[PDB]
């Protein structure tokens, strides 16, 4: 018959790594998670307790509960036509802080800092990010860079 256990189809997902087996380096147990922190979920296959389900590998959530060894994570999961709020009790080895979250907080401070400098003089700092713009006009000098003319090559075997 068919087989759908808890860890079915997890052969490579929960595989440890190449030359990264054994004990976990302790910085993962030194990281601190507060309620509201944005965390990623990458299950560590060596630690079998507090393991996320395979659905939650690669999912990013928000901490809502902090216990002795684990954090409660809220994750939005798509069930049918709507997202359901799921609550994961995950041990710290299976989570890490989202790096994009930390980068945006630096932008928040950088935006506030830039506003403070501009407010001293009113130079329209324009904190808002912009998409890559079409190139402006430029002049290409040819001195020392004479154009080298190219043609399609003939066909040949090379075997």
């Amino acid at each position: 018959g068919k087989s759908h256990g808890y860890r079915s189809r997890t052969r490579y997902m929960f595989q440890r790594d190449f030359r990264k087996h054994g004990a976990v380096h302790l910085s993962t147990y030194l990281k601190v998670y507060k309620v509201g922190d944005i965390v990623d979920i990458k299950a560590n296959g060596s630690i079998q307790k507090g393991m996320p389900h395979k659905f939650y590998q690669g999912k990013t959530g928000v901490v809502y509960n902090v216990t002795k060894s684990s954090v409660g994570v809220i994750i939005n999961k798509m069930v049918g036509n709507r997202y359901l709020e799921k609550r994961l009790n995950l041990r710290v080895e299976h989570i890490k802080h989202s790096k994009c979250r930390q980068e945006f907080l630096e932008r928040v401070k950088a935006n506030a800092a830039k506003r403070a400098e501009a407010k001293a003089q009113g130079v329209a700092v324009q904190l808002k990010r912009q998409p890559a713009q079409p190139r402006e006009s430029r002049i290409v000098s040819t001195e020392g860079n004479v154009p080298q003319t190219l043609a399609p090559v003939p066909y040949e075997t090379f075997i």
């Binding site: 809502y64 509960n65 216990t67 409660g72 939005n76 049918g80 036509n81 709507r82 997202y83 709020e85």
Partner: protein
């Protein structure tokens, strides 16, 4: 007589008719599922702030 066994055909289309809206977010989530030791202490701390605030704006 054999029938069709399973297909997810048309299921994504059905789920998008009035569909995939995110769950509505609130200020003050429910404190169910959070540690009772924190919950019990939070109750006392919130009580004191209401008493402390009431004294200030008497």
């Amino acid at each position: 007589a054999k029938s069709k066994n399973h297909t997810a055909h048309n299921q994504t289309r059905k789920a998008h008719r009035n569909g995939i809206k995110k769950p509505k977010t609130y200020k003050y989530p429910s404190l169910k599922g959070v540690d009772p030791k924190f919950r019990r202490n939070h109750k006392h701390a919130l009580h004191g702030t209401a008493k402390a605030l009431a004294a200030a704006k008497k």
